[PDB]
């Protein structure tokens, strides 16, 4: 680090023996799977004897 070489954007210090290519690539993958089930059973029995 004799010459204190800095990255071009100025965010990090690199030593003399290395060089950085700024391949700033971001890959995001969001997967969402929602399964819903609803069951309702209603029975009503009315008996009348008069």
């Amino acid at each position: 680090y004799t010459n204190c070489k800095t990255t071009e954007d100025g965010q990090y210090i690199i030593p003399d023996e290395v060089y950085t290519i700024p391949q700033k690539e971001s890959n995001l993958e969001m997967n969402s799977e929602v399964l819903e089930s609803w069951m309702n059973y209603q029975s009503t029995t009315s008996l009348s004897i008069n």
Binding site: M39, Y41, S46, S48
Partner: protein, 50 residues
């Protein structure tokens, strides 16, 4: 950027109602009088959601 949304909704409903009314009335000359009646009501509801 790519987005894929697949939504599938299903609903089934079955409602069955049965009503049976049976009445019998006999009336003589103010000597014998018999009146009877029977009512049977049955309602069944079933729902299924996905």
């Amino acid at each position: 950027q790519e987005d894929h949304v697949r939504s599938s909704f299903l609903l089934d409903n079955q409602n069955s109602q049965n009503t049976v009314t049976a009445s019998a009335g006999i009336a003589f000359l103010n000597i014998v009088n018999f009146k009877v009646e029977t009512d049977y009501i049955s309602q069944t509801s079933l729902t299924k959601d996905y």
